[PDB]
Amino acid sequence: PVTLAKVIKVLGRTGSRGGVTQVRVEFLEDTSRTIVRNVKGPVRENDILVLMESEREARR
Amino acid sequence: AVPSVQTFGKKKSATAVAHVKAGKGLIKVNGSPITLVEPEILRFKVYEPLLLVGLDKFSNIDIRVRVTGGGHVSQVYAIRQAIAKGLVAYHQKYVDEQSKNELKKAFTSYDRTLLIADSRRPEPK
Amino acid sequence: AQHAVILDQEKYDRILKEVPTYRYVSVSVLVDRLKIGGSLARIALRHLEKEGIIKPISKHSKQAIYTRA
Amino acid sequence: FTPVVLATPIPEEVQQAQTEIKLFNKWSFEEVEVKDASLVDYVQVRQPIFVAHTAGRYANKRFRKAQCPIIERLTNSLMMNGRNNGKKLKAVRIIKHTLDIINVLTDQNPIQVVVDAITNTGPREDTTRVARRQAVDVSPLRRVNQAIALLTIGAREAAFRNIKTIAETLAEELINAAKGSSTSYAIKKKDELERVAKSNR
Amino acid sequence: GVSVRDVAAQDFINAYASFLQRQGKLEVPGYVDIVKTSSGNEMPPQDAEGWFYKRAASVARHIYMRKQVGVGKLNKLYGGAKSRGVRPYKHIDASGSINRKVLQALEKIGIVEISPKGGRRISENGQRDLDRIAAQTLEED
RNA sequence: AUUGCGAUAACGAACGACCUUAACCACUAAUAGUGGUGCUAGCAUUUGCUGGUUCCACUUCUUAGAGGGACUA
RNA sequence: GGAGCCAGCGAGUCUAACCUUGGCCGAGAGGUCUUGGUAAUCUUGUGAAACUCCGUCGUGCUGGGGAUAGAGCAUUGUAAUUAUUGCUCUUCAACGAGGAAUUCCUAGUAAGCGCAAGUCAUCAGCUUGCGUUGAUUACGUCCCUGCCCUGUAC
Known part of the structure; x- marks a missing residue:
């Protein structure tokens, strides 16, 4: 099922054309358990994502 | 003679001019009642400065407006501005400053363009 | 096939009973x-x-909207 | 009530609007609710307006367009192909008729049906080229943009070489997409994007 | 009181055209139903019988609201775009011969008269006539 | 950017890289505009409303010319 | 098809015949008698087009589209044949959204719509400028194209 997460920090642009932003996101159901994800569109702090897969981490 | 003011509004190349004086609430544009302004789909864009403050405010004053240039749409936006600016200018001189700012609070809450021209201009060469 | 352009008695009878059934009717619906x-x-x-x-x-003229009632 | 007579008599039906602003003087914004918490900040339905035409300028700051009312966002995307550019008054009339139809087919407050279609249609995962593809998450603003584009494109193609008018087909798209109905063009498109993303993640 | 300015345009015109036709004094040119009314048009007027009365009404109102007019300005007013085939569109003036006879006809029933400084101006009987139909059109509401 | 702190067998010197728009306000002038006045048409008749054609007042709108109005705040 | 009805930038004669209002004739193109202007003053409120409202048409290469072609009537010019341009009736072609490739563009901007000037006896689908209606999508990067800067006698 879906999981909501809140953007707490924006880290930088990535990808061969800069089309993707890396972001650090905090789970909304319980704080901590923070994970880092790749986001396609324009994004800001306090935005909410719908993580459809949870146990996966952005490349680095 | 009689308490009166005149004010103007702008949009792009339209220029509405309004006279306000004491009397019995009538509102005419180019000598015709405001209920006939055209196109029909935009007509509420002109009722805004009336319904937003309330009709009771107009019972003692006559508004008549002339609009001149521009196009069909741009001149509609001109007249609504001339009415709003005209109304506060009348209060500013002939009643207290308290009611004047009561009006402003209502207008600028809904849409800044009721008082201030948008200042966009054609791009130079 | 082709749409009818003159009204036969059968379709006239058909119209009067069918149309009150529909929630929404317009030129497009009857066609x-x-x-x-x-x-x-x-x-x-x-x-x-x-x-x-x-x-x-x-x-x-370019749209029309009628209802069951 | 307040009939307040004037030397130019304003019609009764306009005076009655003096108490609350309704869209096209017909439907209320009150009790419209964005049902997904993730989109509440990005679907302007809070400031009421009389008519879906405004001068407003929104291109100057990159998130500022999030404040534009959703009904006006929709009308803009009808003005699309080159033969229709700039013809906003044409588009406004189309919306006016569309909401009427939705108030008769089904019986909800029609502006509520629009909000459902938007929230229900935007993709929630996507892919990018690295050749190969990699799956990525999608931001809430882009979710709204995608929904609007898919809805009007589906309507436009359905009404080409038509008999139904634009208003008829746009109304049908919105209703089918507020349901989970795969008959709508937009629902099919969303599904393909997500299942491909699943394959590559 | 009431003035022509108090009534919607395509509501006054329909009413007055219907009235003017019943009186039967308005003299028609007789070549009606052949003429296109414009060199930019394709096909003649679609309302075969009524169209001459409709234009007579429109001209009367247009003069009433203005200082004076002449035939040339009317041709500009009723002009339109002509397709010019494969070349781009252009503005073209309407037929002169229609409009000239319209003004001559209205003058015989006394609605309009020749002005100094040229062109035509409204007669006082024209004012009195049009103001009466205006009142009836609102009252019918 | 040879655009600068500092360091110190160096010190002191030479070309390339100011002028007009947008935008607010005092001053002009009228061939532009507004209001009043005399006469006058229609409707209605609290004495109003929409127009036509002899003077008077003004400059806000228009005008065009001139004068002043961001330095990283 | 009928009705509604709104701009900005230009240019114009005595050197003589430019821009043309108004009246009359003609289905139209056009003709004819007068008139204002060497121009913020007159043409000119350049009453522009898209656009708005009310009707006819009904998905049929159809009333979409108007190439090719026949007959006739006018205008410029010393002269229109291989045909300047305009008008009227008739003829009614391809075209059902276009493969590989490829151009311009970040706000009063793209695109849609029309007008004036240039050349000029006549002759625009051209060039420049002006206004009317007015969006979608970024606010980034060095993946592609291209430019610039900071081991060795070669």
């Missing part, structure tokens, strides 16, 4: 589920509205 041409549908609506079988809510 679709009945098989009359568009020039009949514009005539039918004016007749049925005059007769009181359908209720108008808006009219615009």
